[PDB]
Design brief:
This is part of a larger assembly, with chains A (about 60 residues), B (about 50 residues) and C (about 40 residues).
Chain A: H1 5-23, H2 30-37, H3 39-58
Chain B: H1 2-9, H2 14-33, H3 41-49
Helix pairs in contact in B: 2-3
Chain C: H1 14-18, H2 36-41
Classes of the chains: A mainly alpha (about 60), B mainly alpha (about 50), C mainly alpha (about 40).
Subcellular location (chain B): Nucleus
Protein name (chain B): Chromatin structure-remodeling complex protein RSC58
Subcellular location (chain C): Nucleus
Chain lengths: ~60, ~50, ~40
């Protein structure tokens, strides 16, 4: 919750290193990439959108 | 003791000396970790043996 | 060994460790001379 010079430099360096290691394909981030996408959450949100759209369609 | 006679007849007394020095060092470390000054009897015996 | 040797996750403490920066988020390191027991012994 506190930000010092050490924390800032470490954060920036970590981001840079992660990006570069991803360029060389030296990292497997399936867990993060599927917790952010979360296809289950995608299906849930899609069904919620469909239900809301049907509700708006039938009120007329 | 018999250990000396064996480790002489069977050669390699140096192994006995090295093991005894290691035991002495370990005993001294344990003697330092809890504050006590006088070495125990077994330490004197290992020293005499070496 | 064969596959990607990093395997980043969503922990940020294993992620930071796997890329080298492990102690770089703590204020001060851990030492031995900070306990009163070792001080009393010395």
């Amino acid at each position: 919750n506190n930000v010092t010079l050490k924390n800032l430099t470490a954060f920036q360096l970590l981001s840079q290193r992660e990006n570069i290691c991803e360029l060389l394909n030296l990292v497997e981030s399936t867990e993060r990439h599927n917790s952010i996408i979360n296809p289950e959450r995608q299906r849930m949100s899609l069904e919620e959108m469909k239900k809301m759209l049907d509700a708006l369609k039938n009120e007329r | 003791g018999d250990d000396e006679i064996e480790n002489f007849r069977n050669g390699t007394p140096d192994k006995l000396v090295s093991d005894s020095l290691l035991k002495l060092k370990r005993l001294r470390k344990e003697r330092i970790l809890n504050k006590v000054l006088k070495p125990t009897t077994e330490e004197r015996e290992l020293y005499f043996k070496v | 060994s064969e596959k990607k040797p990093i395997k980043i996750s969503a922990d940020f403490n294993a992620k930071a460790k796997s890329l080298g920066l492990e102690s770089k988020f703590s204020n001060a390191t851990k030492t031995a001379l900070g306990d009163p027991d070792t001080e009393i012994r010395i």
